[PDB]
């Protein structure tokens, strides 16, 4: 890579020439005044990117010791900072993270001011590091053959690509690994019993409880292991944040006003729910009427209708959620990303689980009681849609995930072109992959009693998807900068909610389908709503009781890295304490020493 | 008090004379070898108590600096220990707590070995401090007149009687204070509307949610204020603990074996539930048949039956719970007390809320459908039992709390008799008073839609009960030793569970009684169990949604003491850091300084 850390794509297309060269000179002054060596090279037809390297080894050592000092002070490291003359960077992640903080974190603390495209420049499109292609191809061809990734492999996806990708890859490993028990139980139940089986439903809800509690425990242990536990204290501030007052330099904003702006989440959620429910239910009723009332060239209208109407409405809701998320201030980038993710999860929940719920609950149980207003319903509609969403939708999702973007794409002559064709790749966001895994866990927690080969299909697809996501990161994207994290984000409570409703939906399914597969064949006159709500009541409360039992069991087992990170915070204070910090009386005149008190005791006992 | 800190009642009644004097000499040796001045005086007819004072001011200063060092090291204090020559004890609580640690915490760390009555002595009945009667009477007559206790008053009940009593008194103050909104709303609803009113039920569930979340916030703030946040790390070990192995000196026990012994909680809970349910339901059916089927001298059998059969069964269940709580090891005293409290809360729940539930749910809705097997039921049975349990049971509880134990009870001549008549008082346990307040909150959260003057009665009784509990502590008991805590214990999650079921029970009540007070008059043929379970379903899920909203709102508002205790843990580390700890290169040979890079930039832009 010729020691090049970062590439800063300065643009000059839409900006006139003297303003562009003034912006360029002010960009290159703050890079030399922060300790970074710059080398400008010709970019695209209308761009000009500047390479960035730490200027000297002593400047890099002084800049990486003052980045270990800061997160030791803010309670992340819990052990003393190594001295600066012996403080070499541990890996590529620490070096690239220090260089990115020197580039982006503003001039109040000591870094440069470069915020990409937002506030003063509006020209620097991206600040991307370069790939380590030999190590990437070695890791790809090394663990394209192993059945399970080791902790050394997870530490290599920590040392490259940072910790925010390493937490996702450890989550995917600990999710493919824990899929083996419901995979074996689902194969056993689909071979032995039929679908809608009670022991498979209880086993599946117990497995979701156990997996969620074990991954909360493993997240705490892994954030203690990777020295990134309290990384919320050193989160990167943002320049879009507009403060009210200034109390000494941080620019505070009253959090109650942000709560009152956060209460717009409920009308946005109601609008998104009503609009997406109207579109999906209208498409579903159109498909039902056209396909089973009134043809082979006329069955294809509602599928093209959702394929050309759902992503447009979802992009409109994404725009409205972004415009509302800029209204609330959110001084850090992590709070903004978590708020945007919690906003789009409602759209993702409705878009992902509304067809299976109308077909499973509104379609199978009523249908005839409706169709005359517009029956001998198709009994395999629910099984066919679960089979579709689990197998064929995952096949086409893997297709449009990694095959379609691959088909879509002197001495420095090869390097200046490999950076140029790495400049056009896609910026990698790990929330999309966490979204895919969480929607998949939602399918497995909600509609697994229909067709219990769903965990088997998810096991095979997860083993393919781990390697495919690593191939996408190393090949089809720019390198993500080493972002740190402690959890996977709001996806933890998303997974808890997903399983939470799964405990209601699967129990309602195994109640109302315990008469066959056709379940409540059309018109519902048999289903007894006094027996449909009692099983939901008792199953949800047994779910909550067993979940409380498992969380109270797993809380009392301290993991080794947490038990080693609450001991070093005693050892550091013990080392601090050794390095520095160096009438009435006539009642007590009778018995002086402890021998005469024993004499009065023996004299009073005898 | 003539500077006397503690009184250690050595017994010699059942022990023969040479063994008693050997135990006495070994008791008095370890007191002089730990730094405490002893003065033995004649006790009761068959006891002999030894007074204990710190021997010298320098020894007390060295013993109180090494007790600030320890909880600074274990992460409780978060600020540097003051030097020992200027480390005077802050109040009576710190001095008496240091003297109690020197008396009781065993010889591995530096204290003496005196465990009361357990392991080697089996004679020292109690180690009680002496009352500060002038300050106690001054505080009693000072805040027997004020409407609300100030934070200085709460800090005085912290400085005397420690922090475990101060947390309860702050809880009772913050519970009497937050009773004013449901008191005013219940008076407004009982004057304007009738009983079983929907807006009063929604307001009451919202008030329970808000009060529980605010008291969790205030508990965190108060444990940060009183410098006792992480006091779980310095909990007092116990001598009943029997360890498996010894790894360097703590005596570890495998926690999975304690989990497997903790799984006996479910058969004990089933046994207690079935037995107490059988006794209470048999008494209730006997009372119903005798009082309303078949007399004035014959109505009094079932009341004497519970008054002579419920406390005997509860004492049997207390004995079984103690024998099971000694089976599980529980190395600390706080874990043992929390486990015993969580065991007796099931007995307290069933004994406290089973008559109102059978009368409200089993009696009002069926009754005739039952009585022929043994109707025009009495409509005011539920209102009369709620009125009884809220008003008259609280009056007789205040009576048997403080009036009956008061009627039941040379130069050193007055002092040796005031200690002698303080030796016979009752050892004060704050879990009984927290149990009374939590059972009262359970009544208010479960059965307030019946007769909505229940929060008004609870407001008056709580203002009386705060002063009466302080009178009981200062007058009718020995002084409790200054035990530290951070929460009130498991009563927090007890209160959450209490309100949790209240959201089901009150909604079922206001469904099935929205036809009058008689509700489902006898035989149930009107109540529609498809409408009884939908309101329970929707009300419980709206309860959980609003509770999640309130906890997510109150989590984002940092209290001032927590925001000052996460800043001093930056300041201490910042003070530590200042007191101590002092081919490839041909690509980077084109442009040396940032001026020539700007020259290449202008040459490439132009
Ligand atoms: C059946 C509804 C489940 C109701 C529920 O449990 O709500 C909260 C779950 O919080 C959660 O994880 C929810 C996390 C956010 C998920 C919200 C998605 C809305 C989808 C709308 C379509 C309770 O929270 P808590 O504190 O009791 O645990
Ligand atoms: C639990 C208590 C549930 C009590 C249910 C009582 C009602 C009941 O009988 O349910 C039967 C099965 O129940 C059911 O699958 C109940 C399914 C329970 C699933 C619980 C999942 C979470 C448990 C997590 C625990 C982890 C450990 C349905 O069959 P059944 O012929 O009568 O209908 C024929 C006709 O009415 C349908 O057209
Ligand atoms: C209606 C039943 C309520 C079921 C329930 O919410 O159980 C747990 C509550 O934990 C609790 O506070 C329970 C604390 C212990 C109270 C148990 C009393 C049993 C009374 C038996 C008579 C869930 O726990 P979590 O983590 O979801 O919050
Ligand atoms: C909520 C959705 C509830 C839907 C309930 C639907 C069923 C219903 O109609 O309930 C009515 C009142 O409901 C009710 O009190 C519902 C009571 C809801 C109480 C919710 C408490 C927790 C909410 C915490 C939120 C805090 C903010 C009862 O009257 P009604 O004449 O029909 O019966 C006459 C005859 O059937 C009785 O013999
Ligand atoms: Ca996929
Ligand atoms: Ca993926
Ligand atoms: Ca009382
Ligand atoms: Ca009391």
Residue numbers in the entry:
A (entry chain B), B (entry chain A): 13 to 260, 267 to 312, 317 to 396, 419 to 453, 488 to 660, 701 to 724
Quote what the paper states about this structure.
The TMEM16 superfamily is comprised of Cl- channels and dual function scramblases/non-selective ion channels. Our results show afTMEM16 thins the membrane to enable scrambling and that an open hydrophilic pathway is not a structural requirement to allow rapid transbilayer movement of lipids.
Thus, in afTMEM16 an open groove is not sufficient to enable lipid scrambling and nanodisc size does not influence the conformation. In the C22/Ca2+ maps we resolved several lipids near the dimer interface corresponding to D2, D3, D6, and D7 (in MSP1E3 map) and to D2 and D6 (in MSP2N2 map) seen in the C18/Ca2+ map. Reconstituting afTMEM16 in membranes formed from lipids with longer acyl chains dramatically inhibits scrambling although the groove remains open.
